[PDB]
């Protein structure tokens, strides 16, 4: 989470499930179609709280055109897809999910957006709220197990990949259409909310 931390970091971020703050921010700047950004996350729970889910949501902001033709924040947002998986076999939760749809679902609980994500996602990972549960134990969500041992197991490692989708479409003038986004930038924040077994955010 630290501002001085290298943006091209190999280490998996450690998210503390006791929840001082729990976010991950990333700037989408100076990119071109086909570029990818990867990050691993590990959930730590050194007090062993009784955590049922870890609910992820997306927010965005600070769009800037920076001289590209596109001045729409959402159109730029819509050029990126996210893949989220858990390992500990790799359990795919989200596969190339459009970030604009992921935003409207997880931020707004927009039903039409949720329908687009529901094309691909296993509903086992969907919360009521429109947020995605990313906390698994061997690829199964905690509520699939028959209670919790005295000390709860560590949740599986999370791996995320954001890609700038590469259309390759040209227009009537022979120009690459996604060149409207040239120079554009935008900021994303992925939030992670641990919940109690009653579904409430941990206090
Ligand atoms: O820091 C990153 O590059 C990153 C990449 C994918 C998902 C979340 C992130 O913070």
Ligand 1 centroid–CA 190 distance in Å is 9
The CB of 26 under 6 Å from ligand 1? The reply is yes
Give whole-number Cα distances, 82 to 12, 38, 50, 96, 181, in Å. Answer: 17, 10, 29, 5, 18
Q: Whose CA is nearest to atom 4 of ligand 1?
A: 39
Q: Whose CA is nearest to atom 3 of ligand 1?
A: 37
Method: X-ray
CB 116 within 8 A of CB 98: yes
Residues 6+ apart with CB under 8 A from 182: 32, 67, 68, 69
Residues 6+ apart with CB under 8 A from 82: 94, 96, 97, 99, 102, 160, 161, 162, 163
The CB of 160 under 6 Å from ligand 1? The reply is yes
DSSP 50-106: ---EEEEEEEEEEEE-TT-S---HHHHHTTEEEEEEE----EEEEEEEEHHHHHHHH
Q: Where are the domains of the chain?
A: 1-203
> Please, is 30 exposed, middle or buried when counting C-beta atoms within 10 Å of its C-beta (0-12, 13-18, 19+)?
exposed
Stated in angstroms to one decimal place, the resolution of this structure is 1.6
Task: Output Rg (C-alpha) for the chain, integer angstroms.
Answer: 18
């Amino acid at each position: 989470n630290d501002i001085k931390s290298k943006d091209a970091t190999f280490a998996s971020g450690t998210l503390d499930l006791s929840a001082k703050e729990n976010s991950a921010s990333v700037n989408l700047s100076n990119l071109k179609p086909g570029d990818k950004l990867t990050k691993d996350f590990q959930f730590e729970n050194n007090g062993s709280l009784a955590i049922k889910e870890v609910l992820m949501a997306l927010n965005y902001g600070d769009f800037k055109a920076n001289g590209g033709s596109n001045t729409s924040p959402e159109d730029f947002l819509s050029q990126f897809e996210v893949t989220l998986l858990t390992v500990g076999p790799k359990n795919i939760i989200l596969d190339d999910a459009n970030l604009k749809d992921l935003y409207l679902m997880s931020a707004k609980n927009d039903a039409a957006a949720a329908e687009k994500i529901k094309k691909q996602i296993d509903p086992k990972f969907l919360n009521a709220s429109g947020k995605v549960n990313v906390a698994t134990i061997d690829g199964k969500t905690a509520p699939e197990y028959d209670g919790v041992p005295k000390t709860p197991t560590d949740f599986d490692q999370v791996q995320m990949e954001i890609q700038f989708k590469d259309d390759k479409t040209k227009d009537e003038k022979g120009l690459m259409v996604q060149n409207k986004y040239q120079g554009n930038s935008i900021k994303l924040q992925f939030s992670f909310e641990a919940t109690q077994w009653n579904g409430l955010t941990i206090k």
